[PDB]
Amino acid sequence: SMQLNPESADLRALAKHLYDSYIKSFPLTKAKARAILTGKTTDKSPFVIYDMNSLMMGEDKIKLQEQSKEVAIRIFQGCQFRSVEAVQEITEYAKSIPGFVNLDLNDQVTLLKYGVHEIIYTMLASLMNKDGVLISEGQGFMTREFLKSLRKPFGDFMEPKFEFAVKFNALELDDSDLAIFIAVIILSGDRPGLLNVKPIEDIQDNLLQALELQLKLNHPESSQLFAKLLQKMTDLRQIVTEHVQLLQVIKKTETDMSLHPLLQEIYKDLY
Ligand SMILES: CN(CCOc1ccc(C[C@@H]2SC(=O)NC2=O)cc1)c1ccccn1
Secondary structure, X not given: OOOOOHHHHHHHHHHHHHHHHHHHHOOOOHHHHHHHHHOOOOOOOOEEEXXXXXXXXXXXXXXXXXXXXXXXXXXXXXXXXXXXXXXXXXXXXXXXXXXXHHOOHHHHHXXXXXXXXXXXXXXXXXXXXXXXXXXXXXXXXXXXXHHHHOOOOOOOOOHHHHHHHXXXXXXXXXXXXXXXXXXXXXXOOOOOOOOOHHHHHHHHHHHHHHHHHHHHHHOOOOOOHHHHHHHHHHHHHHHHHHHHHHHHHHHHHOOOOOOOHXXXXXXXXXX
């Protein structure tokens, strides 16, 4: 039913704008990650962390009393620091979404508070294959089974993210698709405590039309892909819920556990 009209031309311009700002905001794109993971890159191989020995060499190779801490806690704290960096990137990307910076600044903050973890887990899939995940902007690669070997209660925190990634990656989205997918998530009008829902819904409705057109153009091999991505949005909310519960369980049994204060603020009323 697709047409070349002014409306479709505007949706393509919006897709391109979003792609261009995504490239500016996120230094390690899915294209560059896939090239590293396949070896197809001309870059030096990342340092592979597959066991305790290679974890410690990695800490020398990859460029106070935190180092004192046990391996599992140094890794968990590394993931938290990654997430704080990602929040900065996603914030800069959100400001590029047309209409976002004209929303009420409280609503901008609310959308980022409730959206950032869904986007973090989306983009973490770009850096994953069935064996492991890229770390330190592609300088390292940490194996799935090494992460599973960490002592309880830290042996299971990456497993749901890998499970998500294997299925998400089978959809073969590229960075032009992901730019629009992430924008749609950020512009969710059902986040708690939003002042002005209708202007958020208006922006999301337009992004959703831009996403459906992008997917029909870019993926002739599937007519199901738009529907499947709507389901992945709901799946991501359950991944974040499942992570919040895991942090509850970690905290009871590991009460010495330092959570980054920025993440403590984001997690406050996050369910
Ligand atoms: C496994 N990797 C890749 C990043 O993997 C991540 C896993 C989980 C998160 C979410 C964090 S962890 C938490 O409790 N809250 C958060 O926001 C963010 C990144 C490592 C491992 C060590 C050092 C750096 N990278």
